Amino acid sequence: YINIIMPSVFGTICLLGIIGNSTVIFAVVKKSCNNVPDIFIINLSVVDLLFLLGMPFMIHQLMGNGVWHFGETMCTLITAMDANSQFTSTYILTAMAIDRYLATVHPISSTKFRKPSVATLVICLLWALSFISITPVWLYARLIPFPGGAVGCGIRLPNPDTDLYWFTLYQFFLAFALPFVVITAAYVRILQRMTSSVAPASQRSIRLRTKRVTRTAIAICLVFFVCWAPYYVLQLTQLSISRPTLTFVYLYNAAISLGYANSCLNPFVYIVLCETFRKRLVL
């Protein structure tokens, strides 16, 4: 029927995310770390694993009889954990993009401000920034008995129908405005400033390297855009509406599914687009 379409796709997305994250974790731990990209990818993998572990509560809040089985105390904890995981995931992604930009464009000067000693510090700083960004969510998320018969968690804020502007704009500009443009600019500058004065001419190796780097950058940008953009564009459009139309709810559910699919198949994108990882997969 029409009530068994969302949970099946949500469950298969969650399973794909679980298996991909487990494979990445196993590969990284068997590789050993002392490599900054390894630390970044392992942190992104564990963040995505936590996000997928927190996803089922949000799904159960959506699918069923629309009743939040857990207590009000667990409401804020779960929503804060989920939002923190999403914010620190995008922060890790943009930080990895910045690190790749530094490594590619600046091959000599980047050796100074690098190494796991600075990598762990920047990871902790990003986690603290995510905590600060999700602090407003902690204030909110009190249980809202809107339907009356049942109860569902809600993020009711003071001066209702006025804080929607500030909260939505803040989340949009902190999730899909700054990190997206930063990643895009970093990848564009990486692509523009490859090689060195066309010293190796245009032999097969240079062509293959350029094609592979372009494909990886385009794939990463497309994955981060096509999934997350519908969610925030719908959240922005709902700011000027009061009641749904039996279809906007389905669109919002599809957008949430797309976001979860992004969080699940990011490790898949990392595995497929990397030839060294695929070679390591066979042993």
Binding site: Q61, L62, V137, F146, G154, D161, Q235
Partner: peptide
């Protein structure tokens, strides 16, 4: 089974007041 309320940020907002 007919929940078509207002949803904001993965959770249901109290709707118009």
């Amino acid at each position: 089974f007919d929940m078509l309320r207002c949803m904001l940020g993965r959770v249901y907002r109290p709707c118009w007041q």
